[PDB]
Amino acid sequence: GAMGSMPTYFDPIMQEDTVLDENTIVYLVKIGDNKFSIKAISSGLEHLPSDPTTHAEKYWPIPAKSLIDHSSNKLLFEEDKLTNQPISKDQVIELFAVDPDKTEPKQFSDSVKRELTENWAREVLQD
Ligand code: NA
Ligand code: NA
């Protein structure tokens, strides 16, 4: 119509629909056997301990450009909004060229909680 649209995702960080661009953090998590979910967040890949909506600790990185280039695919987007429905391993291979069951995932870091714990312990023992 008169109004355009851009692909958006519901950002768990700010709890708001957010325009997807090349600065969006995008990754895959596994939520079941042959069931994977595409996630997008505005920040936090290096600081969060797990994925916000599933608390998955393991993920497969996906370039934002790959998701943007599929923005008209009805599997991933419904009315220009990122789907919350899972996709099969075959669909993952077809859309993103990654076999997750044959690729080592990355893991969210535990560094922030470790630093918090060390900060408390040092404060206890200082005067
Ligand atoms: Na954290
Ligand atoms: Na989290």
Please, could you describe this protein's structure?
By secondary structure, this protein is of the alpha+beta class. It has one domain (8-125). It is 22% helix and 23% strand. The chain contains three helices and six strands. It has helices at 64-68, 89-96, 111-125, and strands spanning 8-11, 16-19, 25-32, 35-41, 58-61, 106-107. It has a four-stranded antiparallel beta sheet with strand order 4-3-5-6, with no helix packed on it. Strands 1-2 form a two-stranded antiparallel ribbon. Strand 3 and strand 4 (35-41) form a beta hairpin. The longest helix has 15 residues, at 111-125. The radius of gyration is 17 Å and the shape is globular. One sodium ion binds next to loops. One sodium ion is lined by residues 48-50, 52. The PDB classes it as ligase. Keywords: Legionella effector, E3 ubiquitin ligase, unknown function, ligase. It forms a monomeric assembly.
Q: What are the main properties of this structure?
A:
binds sodium ion; 4-stranded antiparallel beta sheet; alpha+beta; two-stranded antiparallel ribbon; 127 residues
